[PDB]
Amino acid sequence: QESVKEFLAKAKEEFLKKWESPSQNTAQLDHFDRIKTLGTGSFGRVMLVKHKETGNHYAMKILDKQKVVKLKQIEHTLNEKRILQAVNFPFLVKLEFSFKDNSNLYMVMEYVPGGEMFSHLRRIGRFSEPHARFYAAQIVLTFEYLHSLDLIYRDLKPENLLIDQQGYIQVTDFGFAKRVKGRTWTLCGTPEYLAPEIILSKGYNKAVDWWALGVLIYEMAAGYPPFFADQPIQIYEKIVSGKVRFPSHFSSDLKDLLNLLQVDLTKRFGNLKNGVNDIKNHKWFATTDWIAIYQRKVEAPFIPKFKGPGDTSNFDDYEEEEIRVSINEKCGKEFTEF
Ligand SMILES: O[C@H]1CN[C@H](c2nc(-c3ccc(F)cc3)no2)C1
């Protein structure tokens, strides 16, 4: 459709202008009050903060430079910030500011108070097909956008999909996203969502995101992932096997679409001559109005319960640790471009 082709051509022009001249150093730490830890990992965490002059709330991702170096995440961290400052799409969390100091790297993002899709899925058990289809359509459009910019996302899982005040998705965590025109080789991603070609250490491409969409749709509609097992090595054996079992409650159209979980990447939907259109035109999506979804004109199946833009009740509790800043600069060379 020409209107879609023209939209994507403008989207790539605007991305490239920011990609080639990235913003830097657009805030500082003492402009914000720290409120609460929203999540934690091996080299970073995310904290709710409030801007002291405007009163606006944000989610601030804080990375310790020395730990980034030690866990071999330098390039990944530079990818994350350079991509986030350049993209713009209705279903991607927005980067508002970025900066660094002697000790840390900071990405200040919009705060989405409805919490992770993962929490809501585990509460209710499983989503109906219409409810799963509403979220899946947003991921299909987001991947069409990212792939047209030559970006692979590589971290799709329910924990990275936040639910906003209108019940739509905001994708967060660009820590494994990368600009790739051909193949790439890094081992990364959560075990249950890895495509076979990642597990087998091959040069892989954007088809790994369409595989991960198949895992996400199965998990939303079943309540558990298709290759579940107790330990990673057992998960990986099931992934490479070519076999999947579907619950009897799945529709025949859903089973047929889940062409996404095709072990041969050269036969996988999203990676054929018609690209994303094989997914968008599949019978499981026959009731989906793609333009209305993009315009946020569809009524969502679920509106999260929260009291206001500072409420943290849809996130969980972590031990609260200091944000320390050394008097000496650490790892200045490695992070020059941030
Ligand atoms: O053998 C026992 C122990 N684990 C099994 C299990 N059942 C599910 C499940 C989750 C959500 C659903 F909607 C449906 C089923 N997850 O684990 C049952």
Swiss-Prot record:
Phosphotyrosine sites (modified residues): Y318
Gene3D superfamilies in the record, alphabetically? Phosphorylase Kinase, domain 1, Transferase(Phosphotransferase) domain 1
PTM note: Autophosphorylated. Phosphorylation is enhanced by vitamin K(2). Phosphorylated on threonine and serine residues. Phosphorylation on Thr-186 is required for full activity. Phosphorylated at Tyr-318 by activated receptor tyrosine kinases EGFR and PDGFR; this increases catalytic efficiency.
Database matches in CDD domains: STKc_PKA (cd14209)
Q: Name one GO molecular function term.
A: magnesium ion binding
The entry's active site is D155 (proton acceptor)
Binding of ATP occurs at: 38-46, 61, 110-116, 157-160
Q: Which UniProt keywords apply?
A: ATP-binding, cAMP, Cell membrane, Cytoplasm, Kinase, Lipoprotein, Membrane, Mitochondrion, Myristate, Nucleotide-binding, Nucleus, Phosphoprotein, Serine/threonine-protein kinase, Transferase
Q: What is the recorded function of this protein according to its Swiss-Prot or TrEMBL entry?
A: Phosphorylates a large number of substrates in the cytoplasm and the nucleus. Phosphorylates CDC25B, ABL1, NFKB1, CLDN3, PSMC5/RPT6, PJA2, RYR2, RORA, SOX9 and VASP. Regulates the abundance of compartmentalized pools of its regulatory subunits through phosphorylation of PJA2 which binds and ubiquitinates these subunits, leading to their subsequent proteolysis. RORA is activated by phosphorylation. Required for glucose-mediated adipogenic differentiation increase and osteogenic differentiation inhibition from osteoblasts. Involved in chondrogenesis by mediating phosphorylation of SOX9.
Please report the name of this protein according to its UniProt entry: cAMP-dependent protein kinase catalytic subunit alpha
Q: Which organism is it from?
A: Cricetulus griseus
Query: Taxonomically, what lineage is the organism?
Result: Eukaryota, Metazoa, Chordata, Craniata, Vertebrata
